[PDB]
């Protein structure tokens, strides 16, 4: 007794309503956005890359890295559903399973441990936990992971900033602001290292 | 086979809704704004040019450099469609192609390779790659190219500032901030060389 067609449409329209929530919480969008935010503030440029471009890059990146799970949903939950092979209730479960598996690969056991105790449910295996518990654990792990990557990328720009300030202080020109002179070198290092292609490749490879 | 009048209208309104995205992700708007962002940052003025006029000049600059491609879209796609020479499906493809060609002229081979492997698809010719994968490669190349131009624009202003600081220190006045003295010199040398006209030539002509 699968859900009637009227209820099936009502469920799907509700999922489209929560589409921003699914992208910003259940996907890779948050980690990429935060790492780009740290990198932008690491250099002297405040909002030169602009917010729309940063989100635009992240949206394409989060679509590419989640193409495997997106295809797995299609090949196991959409095509059997359209071919009249699985109950609509079964198809919904078949779509949710790869999404849960992907979120578990990028989560930390400490995050699961605190939220499982917070929910107060007696579950032992770290695979049959509810989405209500998994999603906050996943987004917490993504924020912490983004900070680690953000600190990693920040260090070389801190090195340049300290060197420029030290060299200027060596000549006794303490009045000269190190930030104005430091910025072209920060652009210099990031461009001869091929930073933009490098960071997006690492962010793509990070989700594994 | 061809889309009905009702459906064609729906597609037209949809592209108008995404019009800001097409400007800042497919056209030359991103490179111009980033380069102009460096120019404002290089000089001692922080918000003095203000954000409004920079975007407005960038929009007019884009319409100038996109005029060949926009006219090519007009001739190849709009004119047969208005005269009812071709169907809506092929007219849309005839409009998409000039945009794809322009994005290929402003991208790099390495950037395309990274994203085509990232998408996990099969292709052998760059000319028939999907626009969904070309867009992230296009802007990534645009950001790297803009940083290169901005770095070159930042050097002469750094040159002026370092000279003024050295002169003041050499004269013995270790108490005066170089920024106040250097700012008129940076502005004077920006005007008597007609700096913006030179930047227009190296920015508008950089696409070709």
């Amino acid at each position: 007794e699968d859900y009637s067609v009227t209820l099936q449409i009502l469920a799907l329209m509700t999922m489209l309503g929560f589409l921003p929530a699914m992208v910003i919480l259940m996907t890779s969008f948050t980690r990429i956005v935060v790492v780009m935010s740290i990198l932008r503030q690491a250099m002297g440029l405040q909002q030169t890359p602009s917010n729309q471009v940063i989100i635009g890059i992240a949206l394409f990146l989060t679509f590419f890295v989640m193409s495997p799970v997106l295809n797995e949903i299609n090949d196991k939950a959409v095509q059997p559903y359209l071919n009249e092979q699985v109950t609509a209730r079964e198809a919904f479960d078949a779509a949710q399973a790869p999404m849960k598996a992907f979120m578990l690969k990028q989560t930390r056991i400490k995050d699961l441990e605190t939220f499982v105790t917070m929910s107060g449910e007696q579950v032992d295996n770290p695979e049959d936990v509810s989405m209500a518990v998994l999603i906050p654990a996943f987004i917490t792990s993504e924020l912490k992971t983004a900070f680690q990557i953000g600190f990693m990328l920040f260090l070389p720009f801190l090195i340049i900033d300290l060197v420029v300030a030290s060299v200027l202080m060596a000549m006794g020109m303490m009045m000269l602001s190190p930030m104005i002179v430091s910025l072209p070198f920060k652009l210099m290092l990031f461009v001869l290292v091929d930073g933009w292609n490098l960071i997006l490749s690492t962010l793509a490879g990070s989700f594994a | 086979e061809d889309y009905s009048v009702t459906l064609q209208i729906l597609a037209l309104m949809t592209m108008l809704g995404f019009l800001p995205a097409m400007v800042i992700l497919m056209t030359s708007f991103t490179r111009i704004v980033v380069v102009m962002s460096i120019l404002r940052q290089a000089m001692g003025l922080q918000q003095t040019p203000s954000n409004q006029v920079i975007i407005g000049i960038a929009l007019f600059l884009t319409f100038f450099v996109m005029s060949p491609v926009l006219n090519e879209i007009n001739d190849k796609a709009v004119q047969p469609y208005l005269n009812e020479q071709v169907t809506a499906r092929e007219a849309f493809d005839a409009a998409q192609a000039p945009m794809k060609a322009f994005m290929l002229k402003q991208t790099r081979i390495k950037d395309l390779e990274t994203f085509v492997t990232m998408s996990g698809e099969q292709v052998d010719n760059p000319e028939d790659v999907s626009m969904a994968v070309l867009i992230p490669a296009f802007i990534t190349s645009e950001l790297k190219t803009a940083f290169q131009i901005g770095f070159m624009l930042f050097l002469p202003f750094l040159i002026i500032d370092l000279v003024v600081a050295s002169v003041l220190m050499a004269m013995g006045m270790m108490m005066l901030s170089p920024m106040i003295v250097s700012l008129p010199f940076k502005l004077m040398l920006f005007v008597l060389v007609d700096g913006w006209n030179l930047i227009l030539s190296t920015l508008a002509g950089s696409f070709a």
Partner: peptide, 21 residues
């Protein structure tokens, strides 16, 4: 695949409109 999902949906709507007209 998933990309063709949107294409199939639009074609069905176009076919339904074409038959209705």
């Amino acid at each position: 695949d998933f990309n063709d999902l949107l294409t199939k949906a639009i074609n069905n709507v176009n076919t339904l409109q074409k038959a209705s007209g």
